[model samples]
Target: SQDPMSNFVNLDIFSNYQKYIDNEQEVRENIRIVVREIEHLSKEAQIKLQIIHSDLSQISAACGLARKQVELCAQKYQKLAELVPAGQYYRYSDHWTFITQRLIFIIALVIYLEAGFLVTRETVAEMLGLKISQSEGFHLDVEDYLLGILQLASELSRFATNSVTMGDYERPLNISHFIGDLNTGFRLLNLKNDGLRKRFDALKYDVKKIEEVVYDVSIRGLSSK
Candidate 1:
């Protein structure tokens, strides 16, 4: 093929492509494992947070473990630093993007699960060691970060439902207001036909669910002491 272009010497026979391939494989595998752990960790944490009488210590312990796994994923991300080709990182992002996005989701969910508030991008950047530019070695994708927040809304909806069933009427009321505001914020964004918009569209269902839960509890005076 090189001869066809009159460039027999154009090819570097001593190729390092295998090294790239091997490194990609390892990074991909590690991220896969890490993301799976994060998935389960986030799932478990959401479940625990939903329980009105859940053991606070257990929730804390699980979140702590989640933090550790996220950091470990970050460490593994360092190995991927060299793999991003110039101006072509997007080409290879699929390999790591899913895990990173999910990691962000886990972080966001944990904070909300523990404190009932949203986490800031700065906080997530700090957690993931994301820099302003890849010049600092690594960074997180903005789209993934936004999607993480979107996922948080879904989890919060589930939490609201569980809260109502557990006789925690007050939380559902708060959730109704919280979700309403969240839905408003999401509307402010000019989202295209991406996963972000799709998830935002789903937020309406969650907001509706919260409102219904709140209405039910209030009508019955379930929150009254």
Candidate 2:
């Protein structure tokens, strides 16, 4: 089916099958590169989102089921322990205190963090009309949290020491009610911090309430001996 000599001379060789093959190969390669780049970028974004959501959930959940259930858990477990022989308490005691303290610490940390970073920063920023840096917005407030909780933990344990030292097994400890209140307060604070309002005064009030409760309940009514 070859064309006659006269017509064949007018044909274009550059636009033939060879060029078509080359163009097809180049197109496929470029498509592959673009797909990989986009997919990789998408994965990175997903991972970052996952981490942010996890932190948000932890902060949000402190006062929800996780915290609300702690007191009941403590009370139930303690009552169960009473049935066990006295010497066996030491086995459970350290772990009980440790877990409870840790739970309480989580709440304290979030409160301190939200207050220091979000609340206080908001106040300062508004006064100076200075925008908070992006880094500041994302700060975890870890140090503020640790400082606050450590103080609370130290003060609380000191009060709890009275129970054993004074041999007051019959009367429930004073910090008994207080620890429960704190557990609840932390949960409420988590709720209080979100969406934004006058959280500084609220936080100040809550912290003072915790301190006052500890002072009253720990030393006097709930004193051990």
Candidate 3:
């Protein structure tokens, strides 16, 4: 442990030794029990990097496979091309769209199709295993600041998810910035907590799962769509 400001200091310390100090800071930053600023960033970056590498490899391999298949298809159709009418060529890609649309139409009709149900407050509560009714002051407008806090907690979870996804796109970190603004907004929006704090906690836990799902999907490159 050389003192940087004294004779024991070495020039390389600014470059090499500083990395250990930086890493120390990083470890300290990550090991905190409470969620703080930059906590999600480090974990998110690690996951995003894994996703980027995995996605690039999969996409490249898929492209290679697809190229081979396309070439093989062309070779398979070459004889058919010659067998068709002299002026009319049975183009591979030109027929793909038509064939795909026809198959999709048929498949869609055969399979089950139904409209999505709107998730009302009662429905959401039931799904989350809560015992709250829709009319028990559960609307957006509330009295105390607790409802607003609940909203902020829910929203920060969302922004964290966005920041995680944005990491792969090399986007700037905006979750903390937005979180601060939401904290400020909490003072204004007001909330309802009386007789509902326990329920709210349960609600927050369930809603937070959305963030977990987002992180999972971002890493796996999976989407509901």
Highest TM-score scorer: 1
Maximum-lDDT candidate: 1
lDDT for position 58 in model 3: 45
Poorest stretch of ten by lDDT in candidate 2: 137-146
For model 3, residues 70-129, the per-residue Cα lDDT tens digits are 233323233333333333322222332232222222122111111112223343233223
Report the lDDT of model 2 for residue 32: 46
lDDT per residue for candidate 2 within 60-143, as digits (tens), equals 444333333333333343333333344443333322343333433433433332342112333323322223442432211222
Error of 2 at 69 (Å): 2.8
TM for every model, in the order presented, reads: 0.73, 0.22, 0.21
Cα displacement (Å) at residue 189, model 3: 52
Per-residue lDDT, model 2, residue 97, is 40
- The runs of at least 3 residues in candidate 3 whose Cα sits more than 4 Å from the true structure, single-residue gaps closed, are 1-54, 89-166, 170-225
CA lDDT, candidate 2, residue 172: 29
Model 3 scores what on Cα lDDT?
0.35
- Colliding pairs, model 2: 63-187, 166-225, 174-222
- The digit string of per-residue lDDT tens for model 1 on 1-225 reads 636754654445435776777877875676456556545644554454443334433666666666766676555555565555556667567766766676777888778657878787778877766664655646777778887777766777777776666666787777677667767777888788987888778877877877888788878878633
RMSD of 3: 27.3
Q: How does each model score on lDDT?
A: 0.68, 0.39, 0.35
